Amino acid sequence: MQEHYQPAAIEPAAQKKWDDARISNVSEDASKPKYYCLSMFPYPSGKLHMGHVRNYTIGDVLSRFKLLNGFNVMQPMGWDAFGMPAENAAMKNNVAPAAWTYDNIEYMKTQLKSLGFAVDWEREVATCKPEYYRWEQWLFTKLFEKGIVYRKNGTVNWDPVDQTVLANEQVIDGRGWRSGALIEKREIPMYYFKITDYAEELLNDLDKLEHWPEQVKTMQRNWIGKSRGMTVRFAVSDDSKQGLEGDYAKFLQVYTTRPDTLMGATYVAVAAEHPLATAAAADKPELQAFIAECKAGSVAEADMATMEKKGVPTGRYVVNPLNGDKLEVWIANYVLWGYGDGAVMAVPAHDERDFEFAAKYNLPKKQVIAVGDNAFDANRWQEWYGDKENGVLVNSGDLDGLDFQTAFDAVAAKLQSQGAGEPKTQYRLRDWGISRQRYWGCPIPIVHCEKCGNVPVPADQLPVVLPENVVPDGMGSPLAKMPEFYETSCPCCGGAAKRETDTMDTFIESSWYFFRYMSPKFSDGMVSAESAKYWGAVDQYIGGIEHAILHLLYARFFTKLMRDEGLVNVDEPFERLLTQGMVVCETYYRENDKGGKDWINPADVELTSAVLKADGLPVVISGTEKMSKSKNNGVDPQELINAYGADTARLFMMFAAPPEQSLEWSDSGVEGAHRFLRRLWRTVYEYLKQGGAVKAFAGNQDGLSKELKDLRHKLHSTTAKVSDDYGRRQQFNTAIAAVMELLNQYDKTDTGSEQGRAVAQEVLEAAVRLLWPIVPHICETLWSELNGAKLWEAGWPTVDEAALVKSEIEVMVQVNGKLEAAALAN
Ligand SMILES: CC(C)C[C@H](N)C(=O)NS(=O)(=O)OC[C@H]1O[C@@H](CCn2nnc(-c3ccccc3)n2)[C@H](O)[C@@H]1O
Ligand SMILES: [Mg+2]
Ligand SMILES: [Zn+2]
């Protein structure tokens, strides 16, 4: 055994040892209990980042821990390969997106393997291969004929200079983020998943996820946004019917979740596209300008509640069906056409948004709820204004004194008797638009025929292969300019036809890849019935918080779709969910000629102040934030691996912070991780240099010295703490510190005697197995010097209960014939 720890010597050897043994190449074996640990598969962007290493080390810690506990562990990895990055790099470098993608996949795969992740590489998938995306095309056609996928006109943001569609997030003050040109609102046909048909299922099944963080479930419930409210129809006043036709000339219909406050409505608001807005704006230019600005907006959903709420009066009036109050109709920008009736009522006294809106325009506020003897101030919002649990109605005629639920039913009774309303359930959830005007994506398996219509491609003809011999030029979507691709014959009548040229939302590939891992070479379905029955669902899912809403919802949606098709047997894809924190780093900048700042990468800086590691001039040390190319502060994990080895990288990330907490890059912290790995190496080397390995202590410890009994107690309490940290709390930093405390007590214990050597062997054999999930290379190597058995067959260390019992000293007491501090307690 070499005296000094050298990762480059031992890390490749241990990896070949694991690969030769095929410990991570698992099958559907009915003898061993299964464990499916999955980390969110990455985009092949080019090279691993520090967040990748943290995500996939966490998965490897939990996977190796369950492996040592005798589980049949599947930890698969693949490549979420489609998307815009390969298209931009194609436009920048004059390379095909597929070639750029497959080169990145190969390099990053090398990086993942060099980190020693226990991964079943025989189950690797790449979502840009026809062998993969043919099966989401298949599900597309199957759901298309059922109507779960449907085609409909929708509005997109067209950039006329970049000749491409932009999402709301890419529109800055009505202009494209890169082109700077005014974007145009265009109505084009697109395809949608009818996800609202599954809204109640997706909402209620969240209750089954006892091992999900409550914030993720709460974020999903809010996104679905189920409400049990009331449709209410306000009759249009006789003086306000000019320009209206149909039911819009008769009444204004609204949806409210607070029909108990209907007696407090002081005005109503309609969307810009509402017929009342159109009729009132017919001769009022300010209204036309207000309507035009609302239509031209591109507020993203994450920013919808933070935009300033503005409105204009219409001069039109409607009648409250309960009290007869005549309320003026306003056009408001927060009322969205397509949500409900595109019209709301406003109760400023008990809805905070209505309170600020009314305070802005000096609109009336009528208190109709009371909570105890609290004072109501019309000029200052108080939180109890919106209380639904502990309020009684006031100023509401015969509704006074009622609570929320009894007033709800009474108002429903009054409105239904008049025919002016009825209870109604609504959802904020919109249908899922999957059409993308992009090239590097899964082709939509639809053929357009002027005789047969939009026709799904038959199953025999799938996949619709995306041609990889393409270099996008930025003058529109390439597929739309490739007659060799879209010109085809109709599969129904054989006539002249054209393929769909839009590609799928790349969220689709990541909505079912966890099932494909179960049988990634199955050629007769999305996933084989045998593999799905065995692996069931994912036991542990690890990923970033940025996917807590859309990705998880889409994955749960696809799981229920595939279940209804009879392909899988589970209602939920992910049992346990672990969301790991971001990785932050210091930033460095230099002031600019033009009054700006030039951000410098940390690796090109040396501390002392701070100066460049190649030049000699000083730079400015700035704030710490998430590693990104924005402020040029991304630390390359490859340089960390090259400088210290994979175990140091894995150890630092697990020790620096709990997995959910933000991890700050620390040069001294990395050195501390490497120094501990050297200490662990020296501890084993020095132990073996003083007499070699012996049989580890086991059995009755009566007769052991007090010092060695205390070391066994610390040992088996460390094992219990570490097991509870890996399995239950999932806090790996405290598990490392516990092993460090065990090594500290070992260092202070004399283990020179025959029984001392036996206890020392027991300590080190457990310590290397307790740390094997975190730093497997050095633990695999150190274990082989201590014991001949295979580490993974020796299994996770067991807790000796007898090592935790303390020896009593039952003594008798007598005063005047019928430890001295214990008798003082007596
Ligand atoms: C399941 C699907 C939807 C996952 C999807 N393919 C994805 O997010 N793929 S991904 O590759 O973006 O991330 C995969 C997982 O790794 C963690 C950290 C990733 N990361 N850290 N830093 C960086 C980075 C920073 C600057 C520039 C470039 C990269 N990216 C994420 O939270 C995910 O859980
Ligand atoms: Mg359960
Ligand atoms: Zn046809």
JSON list of N, CA and C in Angstrom, two decimals, residues 23-26 32-40 54-77 116-120 535 538-542 576 578 650 654 725-727 730 732 769 771-774 776 791-792 795-796:
[
{"chain": "A", "resi": 23, "resn": "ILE", "atom": "N", "xyz": [-21.79, -4.18, -11.22]},
{"chain": "A", "resi": 23, "resn": "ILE", "atom": "CA", "xyz": [-22.64, -3.99, -10.05]},
{"chain": "A", "resi": 23, "resn": "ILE", "atom": "C", "xyz": [-23.78, -3.02, -10.35]},
{"chain": "A", "resi": 24, "resn": "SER", "atom": "N", "xyz": [-23.59, -2.12, -11.32]},
{"chain": "A", "resi": 24, "resn": "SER", "atom": "CA", "xyz": [-24.61, -1.14, -11.67]},
{"chain": "A", "resi": 24, "resn": "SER", "atom": "C", "xyz": [-25.40, -1.51, -12.91]},
{"chain": "A", "resi": 25, "resn": "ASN", "atom": "N", "xyz": [-25.05, -2.61, -13.58]},
{"chain": "A", "resi": 25, "resn": "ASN", "atom": "CA", "xyz": [-25.78, -3.08, -14.75]},
{"chain": "A", "resi": 25, "resn": "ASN", "atom": "C", "xyz": [-26.84, -4.07, -14.26]},
{"chain": "A", "resi": 26, "resn": "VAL", "atom": "N", "xyz": [-28.05, -3.57, -14.04]},
{"chain": "A", "resi": 26, "resn": "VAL", "atom": "CA", "xyz": [-29.09, -4.32, -13.37]},
{"chain": "A", "resi": 26, "resn": "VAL", "atom": "C", "xyz": [-30.14, -4.78, -14.38]},
{"chain": "A", "resi": 32, "resn": "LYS", "atom": "N", "xyz": [-34.07, -9.83, -5.83]},
{"chain": "A", "resi": 32, "resn": "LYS", "atom": "CA", "xyz": [-33.64, -8.67, -5.04]},
{"chain": "A", "resi": 32, "resn": "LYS", "atom": "C", "xyz": [-34.69, -7.57, -5.09]},
{"chain": "A", "resi": 33, "resn": "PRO", "atom": "N", "xyz": [-34.94, -6.90, -3.96]},
{"chain": "A", "resi": 33, "resn": "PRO", "atom": "CA", "xyz": [-35.92, -5.81, -3.95]},
{"chain": "A", "resi": 33, "resn": "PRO", "atom": "C", "xyz": [-35.40, -4.61, -4.73]},
{"chain": "A", "resi": 34, "resn": "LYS", "atom": "N", "xyz": [-36.26, -4.04, -5.57]},
{"chain": "A", "resi": 34, "resn": "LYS", "atom": "CA", "xyz": [-35.85, -2.99, -6.49]},
{"chain": "A", "resi": 34, "resn": "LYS", "atom": "C", "xyz": [-35.77, -1.64, -5.79]},
{"chain": "A", "resi": 35, "resn": "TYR", "atom": "N", "xyz": [-34.87, -0.79, -6.29]},
{"chain": "A", "resi": 35, "resn": "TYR", "atom": "CA", "xyz": [-34.83, 0.62, -5.91]},
{"chain": "A", "resi": 35, "resn": "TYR", "atom": "C", "xyz": [-34.49, 1.42, -7.15]},
{"chain": "A", "resi": 36, "resn": "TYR", "atom": "N", "xyz": [-35.35, 2.37, -7.50]},
{"chain": "A", "resi": 36, "resn": "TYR", "atom": "CA", "xyz": [-35.20, 3.21, -8.69]},
{"chain": "A", "resi": 36, "resn": "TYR", "atom": "C", "xyz": [-34.86, 4.62, -8.22]},
{"chain": "A", "resi": 37, "resn": "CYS", "atom": "N", "xyz": [-33.58, 4.96, -8.26]},
{"chain": "A", "resi": 37, "resn": "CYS", "atom": "CA", "xyz": [-33.10, 6.29, -7.89]},
{"chain": "A", "resi": 37, "resn": "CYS", "atom": "C", "xyz": [-32.73, 7.03, -9.17]},
{"chain": "A", "resi": 38, "resn": "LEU", "atom": "N", "xyz": [-33.35, 8.19, -9.38]},
{"chain": "A", "resi": 38, "resn": "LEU", "atom": "CA", "xyz": [-33.24, 8.91, -10.64]},
{"chain": "A", "resi": 38, "resn": "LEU", "atom": "C", "xyz": [-32.90, 10.37, -10.39]},
{"chain": "A", "resi": 39, "resn": "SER", "atom": "N", "xyz": [-31.90, 10.87, -11.10]},
{"chain": "A", "resi": 39, "resn": "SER", "atom": "CA", "xyz": [-31.58, 12.29, -11.13]},
{"chain": "A", "resi": 39, "resn": "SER", "atom": "C", "xyz": [-32.00, 12.86, -12.49]},
{"chain": "A", "resi": 40, "resn": "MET", "atom": "N", "xyz": [-32.49, 14.10, -12.48]},
{"chain": "A", "resi": 40, "resn": "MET", "atom": "CA", "xyz": [-32.97, 14.72, -13.71]},
{"chain": "A", "resi": 40, "resn": "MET", "atom": "C", "xyz": [-31.88, 14.74, -14.77]},
{"chain": "A", "resi": 54, "resn": "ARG", "atom": "N", "xyz": [-23.21, 18.30, -8.32]},
{"chain": "A", "resi": 54, "resn": "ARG", "atom": "CA", "xyz": [-23.92, 18.23, -7.04]},
{"chain": "A", "resi": 54, "resn": "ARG", "atom": "C", "xyz": [-25.18, 17.38, -7.16]},
{"chain": "A", "resi": 55, "resn": "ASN", "atom": "N", "xyz": [-25.94, 17.57, -8.24]},
{"chain": "A", "resi": 55, "resn": "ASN", "atom": "CA", "xyz": [-27.16, 16.78, -8.43]},
{"chain": "A", "resi": 55, "resn": "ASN", "atom": "C", "xyz": [-26.85, 15.30, -8.51]},
{"chain": "A", "resi": 56, "resn": "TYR", "atom": "N", "xyz": [-25.84, 14.93, -9.31]},
{"chain": "A", "resi": 56, "resn": "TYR", "atom": "CA", "xyz": [-25.59, 13.53, -9.60]},
{"chain": "A", "resi": 56, "resn": "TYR", "atom": "C", "xyz": [-24.76, 12.84, -8.53]},
{"chain": "A", "resi": 57, "resn": "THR", "atom": "N", "xyz": [-24.01, 13.59, -7.73]},
{"chain": "A", "resi": 57, "resn": "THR", "atom": "CA", "xyz": [-23.39, 13.00, -6.55]},
{"chain": "A", "resi": 57, "resn": "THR", "atom": "C", "xyz": [-24.44, 12.65, -5.50]},
{"chain": "A", "resi": 58, "resn": "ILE", "atom": "N", "xyz": [-25.41, 13.55, -5.30]},
{"chain": "A", "resi": 58, "resn": "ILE", "atom": "CA", "xyz": [-26.51, 13.28, -4.37]},
{"chain": "A", "resi": 58, "resn": "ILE", "atom": "C", "xyz": [-27.23, 12.00, -4.77]},
{"chain": "A", "resi": 59, "resn": "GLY", "atom": "N", "xyz": [-27.54, 11.85, -6.06]},
{"chain": "A", "resi": 59, "resn": "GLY", "atom": "CA", "xyz": [-28.16, 10.63, -6.52]},
{"chain": "A", "resi": 59, "resn": "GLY", "atom": "C", "xyz": [-27.28, 9.41, -6.30]},
{"chain": "A", "resi": 60, "resn": "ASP", "atom": "N", "xyz": [-25.97, 9.57, -6.49]},
{"chain": "A", "resi": 60, "resn": "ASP", "atom": "CA", "xyz": [-25.06, 8.44, -6.32]},
{"chain": "A", "resi": 60, "resn": "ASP", "atom": "C", "xyz": [-24.90, 8.06, -4.86]},
{"chain": "A", "resi": 61, "resn": "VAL", "atom": "N", "xyz": [-24.97, 9.04, -3.95]},
{"chain": "A", "resi": 61, "resn": "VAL", "atom": "CA", "xyz": [-24.90, 8.73, -2.52]},
{"chain": "A", "resi": 61, "resn": "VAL", "atom": "C", "xyz": [-26.09, 7.86, -2.12]},
{"chain": "A", "resi": 62, "resn": "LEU", "atom": "N", "xyz": [-27.29, 8.26, -2.53]},
{"chain": "A", "resi": 62, "resn": "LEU", "atom": "CA", "xyz": [-28.48, 7.49, -2.18]},
{"chain": "A", "resi": 62, "resn": "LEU", "atom": "C", "xyz": [-28.52, 6.15, -2.90]},
{"chain": "A", "resi": 63, "resn": "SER", "atom": "N", "xyz": [-28.00, 6.10, -4.13]},
{"chain": "A", "resi": 63, "resn": "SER", "atom": "CA", "xyz": [-28.00, 4.84, -4.88]},
{"chain": "A", "resi": 63, "resn": "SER", "atom": "C", "xyz": [-27.02, 3.85, -4.27]},
{"chain": "A", "resi": 64, "resn": "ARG", "atom": "N", "xyz": [-25.80, 4.29, -3.98]},
{"chain": "A", "resi": 64, "resn": "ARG", "atom": "CA", "xyz": [-24.81, 3.39, -3.39]},
{"chain": "A", "resi": 64, "resn": "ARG", "atom": "C", "xyz": [-25.21, 2.97, -1.98]},
{"chain": "A", "resi": 65, "resn": "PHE", "atom": "N", "xyz": [-25.87, 3.85, -1.23]},
{"chain": "A", "resi": 65, "resn": "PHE", "atom": "CA", "xyz": [-26.36, 3.50, 0.10]},
{"chain": "A", "resi": 65, "resn": "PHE", "atom": "C", "xyz": [-27.37, 2.36, 0.02]},
{"chain": "A", "resi": 66, "resn": "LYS", "atom": "N", "xyz": [-28.33, 2.47, -0.90]},
{"chain": "A", "resi": 66, "resn": "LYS", "atom": "CA", "xyz": [-29.31, 1.39, -1.07]},
{"chain": "A", "resi": 66, "resn": "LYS", "atom": "C", "xyz": [-28.67, 0.14, -1.65]},
{"chain": "A", "resi": 67, "resn": "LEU", "atom": "N", "xyz": [-27.65, 0.30, -2.49]},
{"chain": "A", "resi": 67, "resn": "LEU", "atom": "CA", "xyz": [-26.92, -0.86, -3.00]},
{"chain": "A", "resi": 67, "resn": "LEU", "atom": "C", "xyz": [-26.29, -1.64, -1.85]},
{"chain": "A", "resi": 68, "resn": "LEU", "atom": "N", "xyz": [-25.63, -0.94, -0.93]},
{"chain": "A", "resi": 68, "resn": "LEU", "atom": "CA", "xyz": [-25.02, -1.60, 0.22]},
{"chain": "A", "resi": 68, "resn": "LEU", "atom": "C", "xyz": [-26.05, -2.26, 1.12]},
{"chain": "A", "resi": 69, "resn": "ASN", "atom": "N", "xyz": [-27.30, -1.80, 1.09]},
{"chain": "A", "resi": 69, "resn": "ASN", "atom": "CA", "xyz": [-28.36, -2.41, 1.87]},
{"chain": "A", "resi": 69, "resn": "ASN", "atom": "C", "xyz": [-29.10, -3.51, 1.11]},
{"chain": "A", "resi": 70, "resn": "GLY", "atom": "N", "xyz": [-28.51, -4.01, 0.03]},
{"chain": "A", "resi": 70, "resn": "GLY", "atom": "CA", "xyz": [-29.04, -5.18, -0.64]},
{"chain": "A", "resi": 70, "resn": "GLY", "atom": "C", "xyz": [-30.15, -4.94, -1.64]},
{"chain": "A", "resi": 71, "resn": "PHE", "atom": "N", "xyz": [-30.31, -3.70, -2.11]},
{"chain": "A", "resi": 71, "resn": "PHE", "atom": "CA", "xyz": [-31.34, -3.40, -3.10]},
{"chain": "A", "resi": 71, "resn": "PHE", "atom": "C", "xyz": [-30.81, -3.61, -4.51]},
{"chain": "A", "resi": 72, "resn": "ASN", "atom": "N", "xyz": [-31.72, -3.94, -5.42]},
{"chain": "A", "resi": 72, "resn": "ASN", "atom": "CA", "xyz": [-31.42, -4.00, -6.85]},
{"chain": "A", "resi": 72, "resn": "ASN", "atom": "C", "xyz": [-31.60, -2.59, -7.40]},
{"chain": "A", "resi": 73, "resn": "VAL", "atom": "N", "xyz": [-30.51, -1.84, -7.47]},
{"chain": "A", "resi": 73, "resn": "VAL", "atom": "CA", "xyz": [-30.57, -0.40, -7.69]},
{"chain": "A", "resi": 73, "resn": "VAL", "atom": "C", "xyz": [-30.42, -0.10, -9.18]},
{"chain": "A", "resi": 74, "resn": "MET", "atom": "N", "xyz": [-31.38, 0.63, -9.74]},
{"chain": "A", "resi": 74, "resn": "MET", "atom": "CA", "xyz": [-31.28, 1.18, -11.08]},
{"chain": "A", "resi": 74, "resn": "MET", "atom": "C", "xyz": [-31.08, 2.69, -10.96]},
{"chain": "A", "resi": 75, "resn": "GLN", "atom": "N", "xyz": [-29.90, 3.17, -11.36]},
{"chain": "A", "resi": 75, "resn": "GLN", "atom": "CA", "xyz": [-29.61, 4.60, -11.43]},
{"chain": "A", "resi": 75, "resn": "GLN", "atom": "C", "xyz": [-29.24, 4.91, -12.88]},
{"chain": "A", "resi": 76, "resn": "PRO", "atom": "N", "xyz": [-30.21, 5.26, -13.71]},
{"chain": "A", "resi": 76, "resn": "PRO", "atom": "CA", "xyz": [-29.94, 5.48, -15.13]},
{"chain": "A", "resi": 76, "resn": "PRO", "atom": "C", "xyz": [-29.61, 6.93, -15.44]},
{"chain": "A", "resi": 77, "resn": "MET", "atom": "N", "xyz": [-28.89, 7.12, -16.55]},
{"chain": "A", "resi": 77, "resn": "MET", "atom": "CA", "xyz": [-28.57, 8.45, -17.03]},
{"chain": "A", "resi": 77, "resn": "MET", "atom": "C", "xyz": [-28.78, 8.51, -18.53]},
{"chain": "A", "resi": 116, "resn": "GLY", "atom": "N", "xyz": [-17.22, 8.53, -11.17]},
{"chain": "A", "resi": 116, "resn": "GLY", "atom": "CA", "xyz": [-17.51, 7.29, -10.49]},
{"chain": "A", "resi": 116, "resn": "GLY", "atom": "C", "xyz": [-18.95, 7.12, -10.06]},
{"chain": "A", "resi": 117, "resn": "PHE", "atom": "N", "xyz": [-19.90, 7.59, -10.86]},
{"chain": "A", "resi": 117, "resn": "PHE", "atom": "CA", "xyz": [-21.31, 7.40, -10.56]},
{"chain": "A", "resi": 117, "resn": "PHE", "atom": "C", "xyz": [-21.73, 5.98, -10.92]},
{"chain": "A", "resi": 118, "resn": "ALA", "atom": "N", "xyz": [-22.39, 5.31, -9.98]},
{"chain": "A", "resi": 118, "resn": "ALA", "atom": "CA", "xyz": [-22.85, 3.93, -10.18]},
{"chain": "A", "resi": 118, "resn": "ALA", "atom": "C", "xyz": [-24.08, 3.95, -11.08]},
{"chain": "A", "resi": 119, "resn": "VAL", "atom": "N", "xyz": [-23.83, 4.03, -12.38]},
{"chain": "A", "resi": 119, "resn": "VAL", "atom": "CA", "xyz": [-24.86, 4.27, -13.38]},
{"chain": "A", "resi": 119, "resn": "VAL", "atom": "C", "xyz": [-24.96, 3.07, -14.31]},
{"chain": "A", "resi": 120, "resn": "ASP", "atom": "N", "xyz": [-26.19, 2.65, -14.61]},
{"chain": "A", "resi": 120, "resn": "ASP", "atom": "CA", "xyz": [-26.45, 1.60, -15.59]},
{"chain": "A", "resi": 120, "resn": "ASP", "atom": "C", "xyz": [-26.38, 2.21, -16.98]},
{"chain": "A", "resi": 535, "resn": "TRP", "atom": "N", "xyz": [-40.27, -2.50, -12.15]},
{"chain": "A", "resi": 535, "resn": "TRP", "atom": "CA", "xyz": [-39.71, -1.28, -11.58]},
{"chain": "A", "resi": 535, "resn": "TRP", "atom": "C", "xyz": [-40.78, -0.35, -11.01]},
{"chain": "A", "resi": 538, "resn": "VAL", "atom": "N", "xyz": [-40.61, 5.57, -9.83]},
{"chain": "A", "resi": 538, "resn": "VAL", "atom": "CA", "xyz": [-39.33, 6.05, -9.31]},
{"chain": "A", "resi": 538, "resn": "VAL", "atom": "C", "xyz": [-39.42, 6.19, -7.80]},
{"chain": "A", "resi": 539, "resn": "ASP", "atom": "N", "xyz": [-38.49, 5.56, -7.09]},
{"chain": "A", "resi": 539, "resn": "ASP", "atom": "CA", "xyz": [-38.49, 5.65, -5.63]},
{"chain": "A", "resi": 539, "resn": "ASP", "atom": "C", "xyz": [-37.93, 6.98, -5.15]},
{"chain": "A", "resi": 540, "resn": "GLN", "atom": "N", "xyz": [-36.92, 7.51, -5.85]},
{"chain": "A", "resi": 540, "resn": "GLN", "atom": "CA", "xyz": [-36.24, 8.73, -5.44]},
{"chain": "A", "resi": 540, "resn": "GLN", "atom": "C", "xyz": [-35.93, 9.57, -6.67]},
{"chain": "A", "resi": 541, "resn": "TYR", "atom": "N", "xyz": [-36.41, 10.81, -6.68]},
{"chain": "A", "resi": 541, "resn": "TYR", "atom": "CA", "xyz": [-36.18, 11.76, -7.76]},
{"chain": "A", "resi": 541, "resn": "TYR", "atom": "C", "xyz": [-35.39, 12.94, -7.20]},
{"chain": "A", "resi": 542, "resn": "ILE", "atom": "N", "xyz": [-34.31, 13.31, -7.88]},
{"chain": "A", "resi": 542, "resn": "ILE", "atom": "CA", "xyz": [-33.44, 14.39, -7.44]},
{"chain": "A", "resi": 542, "resn": "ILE", "atom": "C", "xyz": [-33.28, 15.38, -8.59]},
{"chain": "A", "resi": 576, "resn": "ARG", "atom": "N", "xyz": [-40.48, 9.69, -3.77]},
{"chain": "A", "resi": 576, "resn": "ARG", "atom": "CA", "xyz": [-39.76, 10.69, -3.00]},
{"chain": "A", "resi": 576, "resn": "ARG", "atom": "C", "xyz": [-39.14, 11.73, -3.93]},
{"chain": "A", "resi": 578, "resn": "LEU", "atom": "N", "xyz": [-36.37, 15.06, -3.93]},
{"chain": "A", "resi": 578, "resn": "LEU", "atom": "CA", "xyz": [-35.32, 15.85, -3.30]},
{"chain": "A", "resi": 578, "resn": "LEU", "atom": "C", "xyz": [-34.92, 16.95, -4.26]},
{"chain": "A", "resi": 650, "resn": "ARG", "atom": "N", "xyz": [-16.63, 15.11, -5.02]},
{"chain": "A", "resi": 650, "resn": "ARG", "atom": "CA", "xyz": [-17.83, 14.56, -4.40]},
{"chain": "A", "resi": 650, "resn": "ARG", "atom": "C", "xyz": [-17.92, 14.93, -2.93]},
{"chain": "A", "resi": 654, "resn": "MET", "atom": "N", "xyz": [-20.84, 17.40, -0.86]},
{"chain": "A", "resi": 654, "resn": "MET", "atom": "CA", "xyz": [-21.72, 16.81, 0.14]},
{"chain": "A", "resi": 654, "resn": "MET", "atom": "C", "xyz": [-21.48, 17.38, 1.53]},
{"chain": "A", "resi": 725, "resn": "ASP", "atom": "N", "xyz": [-29.10, 9.50, 8.53]},
{"chain": "A", "resi": 725, "resn": "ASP", "atom": "CA", "xyz": [-28.84, 10.67, 7.70]},
{"chain": "A", "resi": 725, "resn": "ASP", "atom": "C", "xyz": [-28.97, 10.34, 6.22]},
{"chain": "A", "resi": 726, "resn": "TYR", "atom": "N", "xyz": [-28.56, 9.14, 5.81]},
{"chain": "A", "resi": 726, "resn": "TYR", "atom": "CA", "xyz": [-28.69, 8.76, 4.41]},
{"chain": "A", "resi": 726, "resn": "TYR", "atom": "C", "xyz": [-30.13, 8.40, 4.06]},
{"chain": "A", "resi": 727, "resn": "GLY", "atom": "N", "xyz": [-30.77, 7.58, 4.89]},
{"chain": "A", "resi": 727, "resn": "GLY", "atom": "CA", "xyz": [-32.06, 7.02, 4.56]},
{"chain": "A", "resi": 727, "resn": "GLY", "atom": "C", "xyz": [-33.25, 7.92, 4.83]},
{"chain": "A", "resi": 730, "resn": "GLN", "atom": "N", "xyz": [-31.69, 12.61, 4.78]},
{"chain": "A", "resi": 730, "resn": "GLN", "atom": "CA", "xyz": [-31.03, 12.98, 3.53]},
{"chain": "A", "resi": 730, "resn": "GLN", "atom": "C", "xyz": [-30.18, 14.23, 3.71]},
{"chain": "A", "resi": 732, "resn": "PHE", "atom": "N", "xyz": [-26.37, 14.85, 4.14]},
{"chain": "A", "resi": 732, "resn": "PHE", "atom": "CA", "xyz": [-25.12, 14.11, 4.01]},
{"chain": "A", "resi": 732, "resn": "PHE", "atom": "C", "xyz": [-23.94, 14.81, 4.67]},
{"chain": "A", "resi": 769, "resn": "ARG", "atom": "N", "xyz": [-17.01, 1.91, 4.88]},
{"chain": "A", "resi": 769, "resn": "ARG", "atom": "CA", "xyz": [-18.30, 1.56, 4.30]},
{"chain": "A", "resi": 769, "resn": "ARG", "atom": "C", "xyz": [-19.33, 2.65, 4.53]},
{"chain": "A", "resi": 771, "resn": "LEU", "atom": "N", "xyz": [-18.60, 5.79, 4.48]},
{"chain": "A", "resi": 771, "resn": "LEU", "atom": "CA", "xyz": [-18.22, 6.84, 3.54]},
{"chain": "A", "resi": 771, "resn": "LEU", "atom": "C", "xyz": [-18.21, 6.38, 2.09]},
{"chain": "A", "resi": 772, "resn": "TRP", "atom": "N", "xyz": [-18.39, 5.08, 1.84]},
{"chain": "A", "resi": 772, "resn": "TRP", "atom": "CA", "xyz": [-18.38, 4.58, 0.47]},
{"chain": "A", "resi": 772, "resn": "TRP", "atom": "C", "xyz": [-19.40, 5.24, -0.45]},
{"chain": "A", "resi": 773, "resn": "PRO", "atom": "N", "xyz": [-20.65, 5.51, -0.03]},
{"chain": "A", "resi": 773, "resn": "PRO", "atom": "CA", "xyz": [-21.57, 6.21, -0.94]},
{"chain": "A", "resi": 773, "resn": "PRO", "atom": "C", "xyz": [-21.08, 7.59, -1.35]},
{"chain": "A", "resi": 774, "resn": "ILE", "atom": "N", "xyz": [-20.32, 8.28, -0.50]},
{"chain": "A", "resi": 774, "resn": "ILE", "atom": "CA", "xyz": [-19.88, 9.64, -0.80]},
{"chain": "A", "resi": 774, "resn": "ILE", "atom": "C", "xyz": [-18.56, 9.63, -1.57]},
{"chain": "A", "resi": 776, "resn": "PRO", "atom": "N", "xyz": [-16.51, 6.76, -3.05]},
{"chain": "A", "resi": 776, "resn": "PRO", "atom": "CA", "xyz": [-16.36, 5.31, -3.23]},
{"chain": "A", "resi": 776, "resn": "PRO", "atom": "C", "xyz": [-14.97, 4.87, -3.66]},
{"chain": "A", "resi": 791, "resn": "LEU", "atom": "N", "xyz": [-16.73, -5.50, -0.90]},
{"chain": "A", "resi": 791, "resn": "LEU", "atom": "CA", "xyz": [-17.36, -4.49, -0.06]},
{"chain": "A", "resi": 791, "resn": "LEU", "atom": "C", "xyz": [-18.87, -4.52, -0.19]},
{"chain": "A", "resi": 792, "resn": "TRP", "atom": "N", "xyz": [-19.37, -4.59, -1.42]},
{"chain": "A", "resi": 792, "resn": "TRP", "atom": "CA", "xyz": [-20.81, -4.56, -1.64]},
{"chain": "A", "resi": 792, "resn": "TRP", "atom": "C", "xyz": [-21.51, -5.82, -1.15]},
{"chain": "A", "resi": 795, "resn": "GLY", "atom": "N", "xyz": [-21.90, -5.42, 2.76]},
{"chain": "A", "resi": 795, "resn": "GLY", "atom": "CA", "xyz": [-23.14, -4.72, 3.01]},
{"chain": "A", "resi": 795, "resn": "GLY", "atom": "C", "xyz": [-22.96, -3.54, 3.96]},
{"chain": "A", "resi": 796, "resn": "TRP", "atom": "N", "xyz": [-24.06, -2.79, 4.10]},
{"chain": "A", "resi": 796, "resn": "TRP", "atom": "CA", "xyz": [-24.08, -1.65, 5.00]},
{"chain": "A", "resi": 796, "resn": "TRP", "atom": "C", "xyz": [-23.80, -2.11, 6.43]}
]
